[PDB]
């Protein structure tokens, strides 16, 4: 069964009772016993599971829930990996909310596998890698990841959102745990704040279980529906992005106004063997420098169809500034020192026409 | 301005874009800025806020995600002191996860008020107290309380879930946070799984921002929205339920088959008077004892009106048994050292016709 | 078994399947067969039809939709008598469309019961009936405008909005069809637009089903649900309403600056009489004379809790003059010919507390 | 502006208040003015004006009530012209219901425009065309269909509802109204039920305005957000849909088992020129006959991924067999001289991988 076919008719989203082809939304929070489990959110949890070939399914109220869920899997003095270029939301909970419960994190550079091996202390108890990673996109090698975690008894975890499970399949690569921010592409059009996690391990499925029913971090019944509802167009919606995202970095790699482009399919970026063979196609997320700040400010303005935003894997496309939005806190040569430039831009690639987006940016780059 | 006038006009849910008299369900992920915070949840919040008489309120997806925002207040190595009747989830989670993030727990009889004083060592940093708690309603002295917590140094938390904002404000008392499994009363349709914080503390409150932004424990758009519309009817449901609770324990301690009655209003029962020195009602919960397990089954079935449901705060009336449900787990000789005894019926008042409550119940009682 | 009882176990508003306690929402089109009628709306058609003591329930898209199917009952040529009174959306629809399609209306006085007799032409097929009217509440005489239509052979049809089903049964009483705009009372939130319809009559509700397929006029499963979910309140609703209505008769009557009150509870009311021999209450909605239009433009202002609004049956009381605004087209002195006087108010009192809606009304009207 | 980029950022469906990227959800039904139309709805109808070129939108809560809103421009008396081969609920609803209101119906093959001449009487008002039809998909010509309306003071309308805007603009072709069942592909995941209208005549507009609001079949504010939202993705479905027709089509005309195929993509189908003179790409909707009843059932139960169903514009595909679901009421030898033959299927292609679709379809036709 080919890829586009399994998101219409993987995992279980109809009704048996009557016969509906989609799945009731229970607005409900109690369901009587004959005698001395929401079934929408039990959906998403199935087509989730199911897309990323995994056994068991989550549904968090949001990507953060999820992490701190799968954080929470650890008792005080256990240590975590992480790559090195994590930022945001979960470099913000571990760092700033879970080292007070004793939870110690240290970064690395998983880029280079044996860095992870270096790491490794008596009290490392898990693994945790972004690939790509945000927003200069490096790509971490799974397969060897899992290898390293399983040899050293390590939970192994992804977070898999910039792939989509359409893509990347963390857990057929020997992963132990894989999530996503369900708000970007899962969700795919805007509306939803959700995280999703899968396993094949019957006993993380248990003790996810646990702490998710003990912290309470739960998806809505109608957010649930409709996480079912948008993943059901994730292969249109990531092949259309697939297919802007090599044209706009033809368009990009060719333009005066651009130096550096930051995107794992260029055969030159780091690790671009890798990403290949863990990997079907790409993150609509790419990176590119212009001159300076000036002149990236001038490039949202005379975009027509790359809307100012913030995140990602929305149906139209999205433009950003690290430098002046997400990484506006780290002090100004840090950010150079880890490639942060004044003048990198970062955009999402939504589905609209790929002839219309690429000619959008390049008459927007021609005003430089 | 009295009580039911600020059910409907207290709190901010309106549309001022539009005149909408209700509040707008955004579902949505992102806002756009016009150059380089849900307000449906914006809405709720500022609800409890409201009606608790606090300046900040925080809608969570679940009292659970409530409770375990408020727990992560503190670090690794503060204590927080518990009345010792706390079970179910709240109790589960505080010793099953968050020791494991070595916060330490201590259960106190708090219907002493100086049995909190005993157990306050240099390390204690929060007081957490159920009042009435479940499922014997156990009454604690809110104001003495929060004296104690402020000259100790100590974050006070009431769960208010029993009483509702409607008959019981232990900001207005001194107490630092209030919270509610708004699952119950508050929503009070049994389609809405939820958690409400209200606090007046300026800083308090900004580091409850950053855990639940940090844990993504937050309550959707959808669900917000209900729960809003729930709460308008809160004081004709609590005032509907309040009359059939006096008549139902009229009722109950005057049947045969009925040995003890379990329910603040009742003056024999422990700390009524400090009850009605902080409240304006009662809670719909009632526990009573039949003669034995065999009784209480009988009761259930008897019954036509009195649905065999696990929850509380329903349109509907429902009814369990504690020690064959909640506290199957806990051995049998250690149920009756704390007065779970095999044949203690819990009840919790709905909204139906009270003579029609009140003759269910007798109707059934007969039946023994 | 009671009537705040019924509203809670009335009707089939479970999930047989699950167990769940509410109405699954089901957003869906089509529904498998095995080999070779939304559950929602069922549930709500389930419970108007109970509420009503009728056998067949209809929800449709709007009051205007639901008024329209069972005029679309009659072919060209019939004839539909209506009370004089009648205005807004129903005489709107019934003289500028269903007369462009044959069907012929004629206006009657029906608070004189033979007035009825004298307006039935050969052509009759249906008698209209709304009571009390809008806005002066004219009470009509149900039982004998049943008794008239049957032996005439007539469809007789009540509009039974201002009184709900749950103080005024038209069935019970001999009526053919009763409906509802269940806008107002019956969902009661101000939150969904919607109408329904009971009837008995097997063939009557057969016709009334090909015509609500034939022309798709359906309410939808999202609006459904939360019209079930707030007709669960709708006894403790009118209840309260009814207690504020009697209070601010009282003050109403006594104040100097209102001369003429209209509502069926007052006993010198025209069919006062009519209206207790088929009504267990009374309508939230009062009509009184201030002066003039100066001095209901400025009770409008100086009143606190009376909203500014066009509509009824919500939570909070609503203000509004109906010779400014739903009676600003008819000619100024024809206006004064059927009592829409200049300083004519109406209200519809909402669920706020009493005292504070009798003071809120008087401290106006001593402004005057 | 290329077509999927205006499938994005066509029409307003923002929040002008929050910036926020999708519609807000205007559960409401009354708006406070501040002193003496729903923005959800209004969205929806802002984009099916945008998307078929014309003026004004209008949203209902069927395809049915769509139909019957137009129908009601006329008065008793009028004629209407429509293609012979409409069945279903429009040929049901005009027949069995208009008629009653004097509105007389002519059918016509309008694959023949000089057909549509000959049948216009002095009494003629409007003319109103399905192309391509069901289930033998035959092709009408809109541009001369539209000469003709606007040459004899006719209301052109044509039902867009197989080849979606996406593919068909009969505004652009002279057509005064243009109206979807956006049930099918609009909504394209079978999860709401909804028309959709649009025109540029004013006037047309204005008068269809007066007979939604008199007749309320108006589109709630959650459907009226899922019909949004599924559009964003029409372009996407309708090419991958398209480029799987194209295949099973050349499957199709090449297997044993399969005699007659009916597509206008078939270059011997009749009007195939005018088809593509008018449109843009293709209907998902194929007929293709087998041997007989028999082999249609096996055909059935021998496919893997065509779900029985009888709707269309689905996520996943369906299949049906008109002489057993939507033709059995007529006689067995009447549906023969009309090619509703015994052994003709229908099949509404999804989204689904195109080689599963051709190859699943296959291996079925290969057990017969």
Same mark, same amino acid.
């Given at each position: 069964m080919n890829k586009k076919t399994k998101l219409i008719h993987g995992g279980h989203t109809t009704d048996?009772?009557?016969? %509906? *082809?989609t799945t009731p939304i229970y607005q409900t929070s109690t369901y009587l016993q004959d005698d001395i489990a929401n079934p929408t959110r039990s959906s998403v949890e199935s087509v989730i599971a199911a897309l990323e070939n995994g056994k068991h399914g989550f549904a968090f109220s949001s990507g953060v829930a999820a992490i701190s869920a799968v954080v929470m899997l650890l008792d005080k003095g256990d240590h975590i990996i992480l790559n090195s270029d994590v930022y945001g939301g979960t470099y913000r909970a571990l760092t700033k909310v879970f080292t007070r419960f004793g939870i110690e994190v240290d970064f690395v550079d998983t880029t280079h596998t044996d860095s992870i091996v270096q790491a490794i202390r008596p009290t490392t108890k898990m693994l945790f890698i972004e690939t790509p990673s945000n927003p200069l996109l490096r790509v971490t090698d799974i397969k060897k990841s899992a290898e390293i975690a399983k040899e050293h008894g390590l939970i192994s975890v992804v977070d898999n959102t910039f792939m989509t499970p359409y893509y990347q399949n963390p857990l057929d690569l020997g992963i132990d745990i894989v999530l996503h921010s369900a708000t970007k592409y899962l969700g795919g059009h805007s509306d939803v704040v959700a995280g999703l996690v899968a396993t094949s391990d019957d006993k993380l499925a248990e003790r996810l279980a646990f702490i998710s029913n003990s912290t309470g971090g739960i998806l809505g019944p109608q957010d649930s529906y409709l996480l079912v509802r948008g993943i059901k167009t994730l292969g249109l919606r990531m092949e259309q992005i697939n297919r802007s995202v090599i044209e706009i970095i033809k368009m990009l790699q060719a333009?005066? %106004? *651009?130096?550096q482009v930051f995107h794992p399919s260029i055969e030159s970026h780091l690790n671009h063997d890798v990403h290949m063979a863990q990997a079907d196609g790409h993150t609509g997320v790419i990176a590119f420098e212009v001159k300076n700040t000036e002149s990236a400010k001038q490039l949202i303005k005379a975009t027509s169809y790359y809307t100012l935003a913030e995140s990602l894997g929305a149906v139209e496309s999205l433009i950003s500034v690290p430098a002046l939005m997400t990484h506006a806190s780290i002090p100004a040569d840090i950010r150079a020192k880890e490639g942060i430039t004044d003048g990198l831009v970062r955009i999402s690639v939504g589905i609209e026409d790929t002839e219309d987006l690429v000619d959008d940016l390049k008459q927007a780059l021609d005003t430089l």
């Open positions: 048996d009772y009557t016969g %509906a *082809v333009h005066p %106004a *651009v130096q």
